RNA sequence: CUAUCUACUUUCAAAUUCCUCCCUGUACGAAAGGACAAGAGAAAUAAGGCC
């Protein structure tokens, strides 16, 4: 049949006057996912004669290798990784207003 | 002695009077 | 093979025990979008 | 927007111009009570 | 492998002795550089993948100098290659054909007479040198990036 | 949506990776849908605060198509800032040069005058032939319809379509051709 | 002095950021602003900018509907343009009068 | 259609020519009435550059044009006709109506530009080095001019300028 | 074999757009009252959990929900603790289906229902016009009666047939 | 300029030129006349260095 929109994502929408003529109505149930468009879950992942050791992974870095690293992993320019002044740092609301 | 500039109002008024040729429906060419 | 809930994770691990916790909201009947509280006076 | 078809109805070509929608009072008590008329 | 047209193969590090005259049978006086090698040794190889570049690159290292004046990874460096450390090290772009094991010692007789080479290395310092010496020199509102100005020399 | 509070709100701005085949398409008309995304323009939680841009991937810049004579007519000018470093280049001596050149350089006209653009670009990634990073095909969550529509070459029409369509004239039979 | 004139701005740049957020929220249904906008009036639907920005964000259901509403509109509008109004108002196009 | 041959056979050479049967028209034209084949079928204004389908019926095998007298049509749809087969070609849209290549010429790939809607043939066009300001801007043609007057399913007509 | 008005199929024989086709009138009109109905059932046996509205209020539109509160830009002659009823229902809207008025819905249909929590005023806003003067000692400042209303209750009955 | 600010302080190294010889009394040239590059030597300038 006639369908305004696709019916296959978000919703189902069924649009209806009433009788009288002066209201809408709009029936909008919830379209589930269905089984078969999903993935399954991903499954995650010798003389050992010494205990294993929890080496510790943490490398010194210098400012700028540091930087270009966290900004490719983040997709970001370098700029916003360095520091700012005092007067900036104090400048800021450490206790800003909270909506729910 | 040259073209001077006309007030833009004016300009105005001349693009709206342009002249609209009449446009037949079939094109005479393409008739018997 | 009929979705009971769906949560959003930025790990599998936590989407998965987020999707838990939407699915035992549905169950007890505590949803976000539930019947509000009646405050109106008994009548 | 939709100006033109509006007075295309004969209503006013601003939404807020003449109509129920502006003109019905916009509040009355919860008991039923009018509300005063307001002052626009 | 044989040498092929096309072939870059590496070339040395060498010191500065000196400047001597030298005549040819025509009688014309010529002015020579003597530069002698010095524990000249290929240090590493490296792919044209790896190596960033379209031709592979082979280092070479220049005359022995201290181990207790040189950082700890280029100490390490070193002590895998089994060879005193270098003062200077230098890559030289080579084909696929022309790659030397590394730790291999080069030596002058890598040249013959009637070959041509180009030499490479730091000028002398004169320091801060005015627009005289620097440039033999005696508006659009702004300097123009380039000028010619006193500077280090 | 019952949702827990920080996954709700993670859910919400997260970024979305996209796909664009750029196979003969003008830049343009990939530069507009890119910048849309890459500002996140097509969100109905946009905000300029809110650093809300989602990722673009172009594919296939080598095999952009200009209309027109663009491609002849078209010049990039640069200046390196030393006395006659002004260098101008038609867009098919800079395709050469840098297959994505063109692509990227739309985009940028087309962002936003300001700190963020280069923030925004960072999350454009340009191919130029069919080849993505295994990394990011894995990120890859839609691929957007392609601007222009192809029109079909006359080799590529079927036997049907050429019959269906009708011989309008009748060539003399004492024609050589 | 700014303080005084941004008013005038803060309630502009409310309009536009609505405006955006309706345009992109209008795209995801294949609706350009223009014809959500002005199809919803005609079918006699106040709901202001600010209001259809948020449900846009905040009630995708109901904004979907309200797109699918205007996109028949919309189609109602055409039929009519090709019709030489012989035929029947479309149902949606039925206008309510008051008086 | 006549395919002259020749066949060089005994120490003599014989040049004849070959009448074939060639495609008739469809029948029963939807508007008789119309003086040439784009009228006669209610196709005026209603083909671009890339109807391979339609403009290929009036070319040579080779991509060339064919006469005004042969096909019969008028002289403002011979010129389009003649614009859109020129765009249809630099487009790429036709590449079995090219020249046949002999024994001696090679195989060769070269840049590929993918391009349409190009008035101009690539060669003659110079860079616009000076755009100029905005009052006298050098702008790049798109499309022919000649199309200016096609069916537009827009409320924007065409941009023959860019 | 072709019609006077027939056209060889082309690029721009006719329009890109696809042609749609809508729904007959008379079976349309049908299934409109089997989705009233549907819809009218489930407020009957009240399928439905949170509502939410847009209301007209002082020339504007608010979307409010059950225990919200907006703050009016005037005073509204009405003392804390007075229980209104807003009036002006453009749209109620639930999970699975929304009410839409042409343009307000019947008072039968929809009742949301608001409280006065406060009567205040707004902070004091500056206005400062740079006229040729010194213009600091000249600063007027303003503040807007304000009203608090909270949002008790929104009702609807199953009123649709 | 007792120089606060802007700008700038290595676009690192593809080189130009005039003469002589040669090619050549050759190609061209009715003929006279007379190449061009290809080179060779010698100069100078500029750039870069060096004792
Ligand atoms: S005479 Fe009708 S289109 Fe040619
Ligand atoms: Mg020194
Ligand atoms: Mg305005
Ligand atoms: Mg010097």
């Known amino acids: 049949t006639y369908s305004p929109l696709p019916d296959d994502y978000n919703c189902n929408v069924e649009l209806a006057l009433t009788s009288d003529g002066r209201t809408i109505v709009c029936y909008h149930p919830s379209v589930d996912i269905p089984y078969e468009h999903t993935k399954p879950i991903p499954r995650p992942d010798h003389d050992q004669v010494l205990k294993t050791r929890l080496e510790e992974k943490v490398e010194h870095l210098e400012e700028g290798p540091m930087i270009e690293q966290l900004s490719k992993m983040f997709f970001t320019t370098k700029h916003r990784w360095y520091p700012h002044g005092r007067y900036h740092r104090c400048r800021k609301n450490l206790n800003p207003p909270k909506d729910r | 002695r040259h073209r001077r500039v006309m007030h833009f109002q004016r300009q105005k008024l001349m693009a709206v009077t342009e002249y609209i040729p009449p446009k037949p429906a079939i094109h005479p060419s393409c008739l018997p | 093979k009929k979705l009971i809930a769906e949560g959003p994770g930025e790990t599998v691990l936590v989407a998965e025990e987020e999707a838990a916790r939407v699915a035992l909201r549905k169950l007890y009947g505590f949803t976000e979008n539930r019947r509000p509280w009646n405050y109106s006076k008994p009548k | 927007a939709g100006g033109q078809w509006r007075l295309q109805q004969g209503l006013a070509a601003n939404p807020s111009g003449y109509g129920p929608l502006t003109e019905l009072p916009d509040w009355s008590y919860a008991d039923g009570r009018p509300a005063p008329p307001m002052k626009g | 492998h044989p040498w092929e047209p096309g072939s870059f193969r590496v070339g040395l590090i060498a010191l500065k002795l000196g400047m001597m005259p030298l005549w040819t049978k025509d009688g014309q006086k010529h002015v020579v550089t003597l530069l002698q090698v010095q524990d000249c040794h290929v240090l590493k190889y490296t792919s044209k993948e790896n190596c960033n570049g379209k031709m592979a690159t082979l280092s070479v290292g220049g005359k022995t100098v201290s181990r207790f004046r040189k950082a700890t990874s280029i100490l390490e460096f070193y002590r895998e290659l089994g060879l005193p450390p270098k003062q200077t090290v230098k890559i030289f772009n080579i084909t696929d054909n022309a790659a030397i094991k590394p730790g291999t010692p080069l030596y002058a007789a890598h040249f013959r007479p009637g070959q041509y080479v180009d030499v490479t290395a730091k000028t002398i310092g004169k320091g801060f040198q005015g627009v005289m010496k620097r440039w033999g020199f005696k508006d659009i509102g702004r300097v123009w990036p380039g000028t010619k100005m006193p500077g280090k020399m | ?177 | 002095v700014k303080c005084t004139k941004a008013r005038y701005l803060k309630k502009k740049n409310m309009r536009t950021l609505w405006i955006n957020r309706i345009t992109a929220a209008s795209q995801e249904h294949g609706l350009k602003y223009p014809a959500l906008i002005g199809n919803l009036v005609k079918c006699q639907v106040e709901l202001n900018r600010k209001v259809l920005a948020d449900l846009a964000i905040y009630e995708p259901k109901t904004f979907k509907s309200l797109a699918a509403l205007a996109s028949r509109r919309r189609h109602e509008g055409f039929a009519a343009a090709l019709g030489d109004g012989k035929e029947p108002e479309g149902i949606f196009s039925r206008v309510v009068q008051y008086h | 259609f006549r395919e002259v041959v020749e066949t060089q056979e005994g120490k003599t050479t014989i040049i004849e020519g070959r009448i074939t049967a060639t495609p008739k028209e469809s029948p029963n034209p939807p508007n008789p009435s119309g003086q040439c084949p784009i009228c006669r079928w209610n196709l005026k204004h209603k083909y671009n550059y890339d109807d391979v389908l339609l403009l290929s019926q009036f070319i040579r095998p080779h991509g060339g044009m064919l006469p005004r007298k042969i096909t019969g049509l008028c002289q403002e749809e011979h010129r389009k006709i003649e614009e859109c087969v020129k765009m249809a070609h630099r487009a790429g849209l036709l590449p079995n109506h090219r020249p046949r290549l002999p024994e001696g010429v090679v195989p060769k790939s070269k840049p590929q530009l993918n391009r349409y809607l190009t008035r101009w043939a690539p060669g003659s066009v110079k860079p616009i080095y000076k755009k100029g300001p905005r009052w006298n801007r050098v702008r790049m043609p798109v499309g022919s001019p000649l199309l200016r007057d096609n069916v537009c399913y827009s409320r924007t007509p065409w941009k023959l300028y860019h | 074999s072709y019609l006077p008005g027939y056209v060889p199929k082309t690029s721009l024989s006719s329009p890109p757009w696809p042609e749609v086709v809508l729904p007959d009138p008379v079976e349309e009109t049908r299934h409109h009252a089997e989705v009233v109905k549907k819809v009218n059932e489930m407020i009957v046996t009240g399928q439905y959990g949170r509502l939410f509205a847009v209301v007209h209020f002082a020339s504007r539109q608010w979307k409010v929900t059950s225990e919200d509160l907006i703050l009016i830009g005037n005073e509204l002659d009405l003392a804390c603790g007075e229980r209104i009823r807003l009036e002006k229902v453009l749209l109620v809207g639930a999970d699975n289906f929304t009410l839409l008025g042409k343009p307000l819905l019947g008072k039968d249909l929809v009742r949301v229902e608001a409280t006065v929590i406060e009567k205040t005023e707004s902070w004091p806003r500056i206005i400062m016009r740079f006229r040729k003067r010194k213009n600091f000692k000249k600063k007027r400042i303003v503040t807007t009666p304000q009203t608090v209303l909270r949002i008790n209750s929104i009702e609807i009955a199953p009123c649709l047939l």
């Open chain 6, 1 to 177: 949506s019952s949702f827990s509070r920080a996954p709700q709100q993670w859910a919400t701005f997260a970024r979305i990776w996209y796909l664009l085949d750029g196979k003969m398409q003008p830049p343009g008309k990939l530069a507009a849908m890119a910048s849309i995304r890459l500002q996140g323009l097509h969100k109905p939680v946009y905000h300029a605060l809110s650093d809300c841009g989602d990722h673009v991937v172009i594919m296939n810049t080598r095999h952009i198509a200009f209309s027109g004579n663009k491609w002849e007519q078209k010049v990039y000018s640069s200046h390196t800032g030393y006395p006659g470093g002004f260098r101008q280049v038609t867009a098919a001596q800079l395709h050469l040069r840098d297959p994505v050149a063109i692509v990227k350089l739309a985009i940028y006209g087309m962002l936003p005058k300001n700190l963020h653009r280069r923030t925004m670009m960072e999350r454009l990634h340009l191919f130029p032939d069919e080849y993505i990073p295994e990394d990011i095909l894995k990120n890859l969550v839609e691929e957007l319809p392609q601007p222009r529509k192809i029109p079909k070459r006359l080799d590529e029409y079927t036997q049907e379509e050429i019959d269906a369509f009708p011989r309008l004239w009748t060539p003399p039979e004492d024609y050589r051709l």
